[PDB]
Design a protein around this motif. Structure first.
Motif, PDB file in Angstrom:
ATOM      1  N   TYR B  36       0.609  -1.660   0.074  1.00 62.46           N
ATOM      2  CA  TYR B  36       0.252  -0.133  -0.167  1.00 62.46           C
ATOM      3  C   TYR B  36       0.523   1.094   0.324  1.00 62.46           C
ATOM      4  CZ  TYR B  36      -3.143  -3.698   1.259  1.00 62.46           C
ATOM      5  OH  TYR B  36      -3.751  -4.276   1.697  1.00 62.46           O
ATOM      6  N   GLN B  38       0.237   5.417   0.802  1.00 58.32           N
ATOM      7  CA  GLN B  38       0.306   6.440   1.752  1.00 58.32           C
ATOM      8  C   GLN B  38       0.577   7.561   1.872  1.00 58.32           C
ATOM      9  OE1 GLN B  38      -0.708   5.696   5.903  1.00 58.32           O
ATOM     10  NE2 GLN B  38      -2.348   6.636   5.681  1.00 58.32           N
ATOM     11  N   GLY B  42      -2.833  11.577   3.376  1.00 55.55           N
ATOM     12  CA  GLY B  42      -3.726  10.379   2.476  1.00 55.55           C
ATOM     13  C   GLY B  42      -3.993   9.428   2.972  1.00 55.55           C
ATOM     14  N   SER B  43      -4.940   9.319   2.315  1.00 51.49           N
ATOM     15  CA  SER B  43      -5.231   7.173   3.150  1.00 51.49           C
ATOM     16  C   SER B  43      -4.887   6.199   2.358  1.00 51.49           C
ATOM     17  CB  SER B  43      -7.634   7.340   2.210  1.00 51.49           C
ATOM     18  OG  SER B  43      -7.173   6.996   1.017  1.00 51.49           O
ATOM     19  N   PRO B  44      -4.519   5.145   2.771  1.00 53.35           N
ATOM     20  CA  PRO B  44      -4.021   4.413   2.250  1.00 53.35           C
ATOM     21  C   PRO B  44      -4.141   3.257   0.913  1.00 53.35           C
ATOM     22  CG  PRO B  44      -3.854   3.636   4.360  1.00 53.35           C
ATOM     23  CD  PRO B  44      -4.914   5.166   3.920  1.00 53.35           C
ATOM     24  N   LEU B  46      -3.596   0.391  -2.297  1.00 51.41           N
ATOM     25  CA  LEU B  46      -3.653  -0.369  -2.800  1.00 51.41           C
ATOM     26  C   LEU B  46      -2.687  -0.824  -4.020  1.00 51.41           C
ATOM     27  CD1 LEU B  46      -3.382  -2.909  -2.471  1.00 51.41           C
ATOM     28  CD2 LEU B  46      -5.282  -3.347  -3.081  1.00 51.41           C
TER      29      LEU B  46
END
Ligand SMILES: [K+]
Ligand SMILES: [K+]
Ligand SMILES: [K+]
Ligand SMILES: [K+]
Ligand SMILES: [K+]
Lengths: 103, 106, 219, 103, 106
Positions: B36, B38, B42-44, B46
């Protein structure tokens, strides 16, 4: 269509059902148990097959009470289904063998 | 509980250069590893699934590799936007776990 | 569209409890699992728990103190996480995620920043930031807005309602006297301003307030 | 009730008995052998099942002479029981197939 | 013969603070680990069974965790009465064995 054929037909259907259901339930039952591997659906389906055929290679298996209970149902349905198919075949060979004898 | 070790925690690389992050599981886990990205605030997100499988929307620049215990997340020609923290995650054994993370500095 | 919607913030007094949500949209399957992840500022991601909506069962991390309780509403496609008897130690961002039961987190929510303090909520005051009449301009000009006196975190600052993203620097908030303060900077062609308007949008989820402040040259 | 049904009925009962007894005896026989894992009753019952169905995933197994002897009895009873069930099914299909032929 | 290593042998903690004892088996043993508490002149008493299962009569304050080789016995908010020696014990392979023990000091 004779019964041994119809039954053998059904056994198949039910088996596939048992595999899918057993796959789903194995995951539901095994997640939450530290170290369990039977926790994702695709490998859970493979596991169900290798169990139902009784191959059981040892790459995956249940560790919880419920996972093992689910496992037993898969085993039984699998042995019965393939076993019922054997029954139908024998019945098929018997009939034709009687005819071959003029009966 | 599988321990995923990510070291070094920080990786300095020059623009357009190749970079590789490392993630070592405490025990063998086939290829059940997910990476992942990030970014700051920011959000993680994939990047790679199951050690090397690509993901739609993600640049062909990103690649993965490894099996068993040693896994690697690679990037060919790193650019400004690759700056962020990177985490590996295993789904081989319950419960799922996360690597401590590696920051990419340009 | 956003697959998982999460509230922006949640202020909670020490000893009290809160109930975070996670509205889910898009394709949904009986094999879906909704995970929760804790991340304290400057640290890694921590697995908190998971739950399968179709059946309703949930599991938790055995390596930490159980503070959460997961539930699900199949009709409204919403997952909830009850955090109780919280302390500053529980102050962090709580992300929700969706796994198709294949081991990976295909999608993450924006996250809900939870702050544990006795302090009271307070909206931010936005002040413009235009150059001085003596400042010389180049091919570019720098502008901004001052956001101080707000609590708790966080705030999201955008320019021209998002249309302006290039050359924007939003500095980390500084805490002083139970109040945060931060500024945002935006650089654009010297010529384009003040002919083409430039406004800063400052939203404060915690107080449910979003104000605008156009930046015009000093008198 | 025909014999194939009654026998199949019995086979079941005896199998379950063999599993319980084999579980008990496996533990009695394996404790005292350095490194043996078949030493607690719950997993000893799981082992007995996976042996009787012949799945044998490899997570547990006997290391002592007696444990292996116990294991063989479980195997045999298991293969026979499931096998006898197959016999009954074939017999069931045969009878009905004869009727379907007016005999 | 599985060797259960308990280190450190002594653990100093302040009142109401969280504490964690460690127990590492020489080889993997699933979750076949049991924790016991023995106070001065007192007889051993079962706390957690199979790594994390609770036991009636025991305070919810006590918790367990781990699988494979690394196990942990946790206590939230330690109080005077938690003072004693703690032992882990494996039942994965014959014969059953005991960890050397960790004393809790307040
Ligand atoms: K077999
Ligand atoms: K095997
Ligand atoms: K094996
Ligand atoms: K067979
Ligand atoms: K086999």
């Amino acid at each position: 269509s004779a019964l041994h054929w119809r039954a053998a037909g059904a056994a198949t259907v039910l088996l596939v059902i048992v595999l899918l259901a057993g796959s789903y339930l194995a995951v539901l039952a095994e997640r939450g148990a530290p170290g369990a591997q039977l926790i994702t659906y695709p490998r859970a389906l493979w596991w169900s097959v290798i169990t139902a055929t009784t191959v059981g290679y040892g790459d995956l298996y249940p560790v919880t009470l419920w996972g093992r209970c689910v496992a037993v149902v898969v085993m039984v349905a699998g042995i019965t289904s393939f076993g019922l198919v054997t029954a139908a075949l024998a019945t098929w060979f018997v009939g034709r063998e009687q005819e071959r004898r003029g009966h | 509980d599988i321990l995923l070790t990510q070291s070094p925690a920080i990786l300095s690389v020059s623009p357009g250069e190749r970079v590789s992050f490392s993630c070592r599981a405490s025990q063998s886990i086939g290829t059940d590893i997910h990476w992942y990205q990030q970014r700051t605030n920011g959000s993680p997100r994939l990047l790679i699934k199951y050690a090397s499988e690509s993901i739609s929307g993600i640049p062909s620049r990103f690649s993965g590799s490894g099996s068993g215990t040693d896994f690697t997340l690679s990037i060919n020609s790193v650019e400004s936007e690759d700056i962020a923290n990177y985490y590996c995650q295993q789904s081989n054994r319950w419960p799922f776990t996360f690597g401590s993370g590696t920051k990419l500095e340009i | 569209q956003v697959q998982l919607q999460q509230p922006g913030a949640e202020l909670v007094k020490p000893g009290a409890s809160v109930k975070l949500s996670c509205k889910a949209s898009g394709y949904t399957f009986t094999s879906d699992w909704i995970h929760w992840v804790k991340q304290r500022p400057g640290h890694g991601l921590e697995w908190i728990g998971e739950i399968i909506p179709s059946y309703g069962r949930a599991n938790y991390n055995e390596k930490i103190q159980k503070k959460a309780t997961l539930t699900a509403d199949k009709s409204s496609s919403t997952a909830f996480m009850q955090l109780s008897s919280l302390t500053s130690e529980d102050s962090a961002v709580y992300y929700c995620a969706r796994e198709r039961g294949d081991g990976y987190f295909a999608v993450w929510g924006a996250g809900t920043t939870v702050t544990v303090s006795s302090a009271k909520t307070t909206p931010p005051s936005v002040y413009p930031l235009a150059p001085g009449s003596a400042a010389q301009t180049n091919s570019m000009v720098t502008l901004g807005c001052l956001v101080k006196g707000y609590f708790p975190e966080p705030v999201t600052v955008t320019w021209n309602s998002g249309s302006l993203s290039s050359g924007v620097h939003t500095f980390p908030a500084v805490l002083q006297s139970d109040l945060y303060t931060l500024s945002s900077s935006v650089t654009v062609p010297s010529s384009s301003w003040p002919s083409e308007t430039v406004t800063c949008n400052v939203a404060h989820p915690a107080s449910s307030t979003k104000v605008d402040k156009k930046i015009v040259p000093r008198d």
